[PDB]
Amino acid sequence: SDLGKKLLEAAINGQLDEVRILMANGADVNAADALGVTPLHLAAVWGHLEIVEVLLKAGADVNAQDQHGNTPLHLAAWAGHLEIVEVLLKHGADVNAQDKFGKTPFDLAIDNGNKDIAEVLQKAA
Amino acid sequence: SDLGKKLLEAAINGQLDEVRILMANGADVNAADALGVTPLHLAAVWGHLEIVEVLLKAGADVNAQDQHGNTPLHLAAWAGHLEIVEVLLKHGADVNAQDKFGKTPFDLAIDNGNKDIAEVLQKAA
Amino acid sequence: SDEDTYYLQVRGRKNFEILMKLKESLELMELVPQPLVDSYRQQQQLLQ
Amino acid sequence: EDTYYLQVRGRKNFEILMKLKESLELMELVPQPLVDSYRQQQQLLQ
Amino acid sequence: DELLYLPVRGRETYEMLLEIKESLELMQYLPQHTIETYRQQQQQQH
Amino acid sequence: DELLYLPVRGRETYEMLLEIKESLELMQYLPQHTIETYRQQQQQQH
């Protein structure tokens, strides 16, 4: 039973209790699928604040990059999850991290009309 | 883009003229596709008597086998082409040739209600 | 198993043209001589 | 991007086209950044 | 008509792509007539 | 659920299988609820 895949599936599906029990049985919070996508990425994009927090607390890399150079901050910004953006900045998310098309989290926020989030990222400079 | 390929295409499509011209430009009548299927197989299953005859005259293997051990006789019998069956027997088609499931041309004839053809194959023993 | 006809709908033009191209090959499958189907399948499992 | 209708002979054909209709339509709900990440890996595996 | 190698994650998808691949690859064994007959049956269907 | 390599004869076929493979492979990135929502929306049109 490989706990990497199980933890990624749980992050996507917002299964807080499932995530907690997988970590306690030794799951790697920095487990990445074929595309370099981590549980922190997936919890961030699907708007699972509590799960984002347990993973960060458990030492989840805050500026982990997938194939595309998407960080959790990129995906939260993309997805319009302000509360999650705020936490990532707190845990030291690179505001200036660039995806492979040179988009910053700020740019992704703008492109999808997340003005509140863009204002936060501009001032978090 | 292959002479082999072009001749298989012509056999399927009953293009007698085309088959004659491809052979005269040095097409191989024993050309087989990925599955070991030959022009004689394809002319036989699609009921192209005249094309069957030009290929046999031009030295086509009468008991050529595909991946499955299908001979031209198998496919003629399957397809209900009595005139073509008769010619293949004349040119020495193995009545007892077995596909990989141990089915004979006789068996395939019966299973599809080609009684006239089955009667011929039973007696051609 | 019934030879009955089913309807389905699909959002977006490009999705339609993909499903049609497949509807075609899938429906035309029925007209391919069984012996050549079996010859194909026995070589698919030979490449497993 | 309106709605198009199509018909199909035979149950097994229908259940295949439905399974595909599903993934194709559900495509629109997959975050672009993960799509971009997938495509950038497809290039390098071809 | 080379033998190309398509990368696939998981059986569900492999098995599903295999089924489809089969219908596509097996149409080389149909007369041009038979296919045209069918597309005329479909354009006369729209 | 490892990366399997599917043999394909023909580019037209490979290219066609590639399009489809994308939609199927990318559904791994959707929550269970999102798919159920969609199938419930499809049960409605039986």
Numbering used by the authors:
A (entry chain F), B (entry chain E): 2 to 126
C (entry chain B): 350 to 397
D (entry chain D): 352 to 397
E (entry chain A), F (entry chain C): 359 to 404
Lines from the paper:
All members of the p53 family form tetramers in their active state through a dedicated oligomerization domain that structurally assembles as a dimer of dimers. In contrast, p63 and p73 form hetero-oligomers of all possible stoichiometries, with the hetero-tetramer built from a p63 dimer and a p73 dimer being thermodynamically more stable than the two homo-tetramers. Here we report the generation and characterization of Designed Ankyrin Repeat Proteins (DARPins) that bind with high affinity and selectivity to the p632/p732 hetero-tetramer. DARPins are small kDa proteins consisting of multiple stacked helical hairpin units in which certain positions can be randomized to select tight binders for a folded target domain.
For a structural understanding of the interaction and the selectivity, we solved the X-ray crystal structures of complexes of both DARPins with the p632/p732 hetero-tetramer stabilized by mutations, thus the same DARPins that were used for the in vitro selection. The combination of an E363K mutation in the p73 OD and a K377E mutation in the p63 OD thus selectively stabilizes the p632/p732 hetero-tetramer. Of these DARPin F11 represents a DARPin with three internal helical repeats and DARPin A2 a DARPin with only two internal helical repeats, always flanked by an N- and C-capping repeat. Titration with the DARPins yielded dissociation constants of KD = 10 nM for DARPin F11 and KD = 17 nM for DARPin A2 and a 2:1 (DARPin : hetero-tetramer) stoichiometry, while a control DARPin did not bind at all. We also measured binding to the two homo-tetrameric ODs of p63 and p73 by ITC but could not detect any binding, demonstrating that the interaction of both DARPins with the hetero-tetramer is not only highly affine but also highly specific. A detailed structural analysis further revealed that both DARPins bound to the hinge region between the first and the second helix of both p63 and p73 ODs. D The same as in (C) but with DARPin A2. This DARPin shows an even higher selectivity for the p632/p732 hetero-tetramer with additional resonances representing less than 10% of the population. The analysis of the DARPin–hetero-tetramer crystal structures revealed that the C-termini of both DARPins within the complex were pointing into the same direction, which enables the efficient dimerization of the DARPins via a leucine zipper for increasing the avidity. During the expression time of the p73 peak a strong pulldown signal using the DARPin A2 was detected that was not present at times in the absence of p73 expression, while a control DARPin did not show binding at any time point.
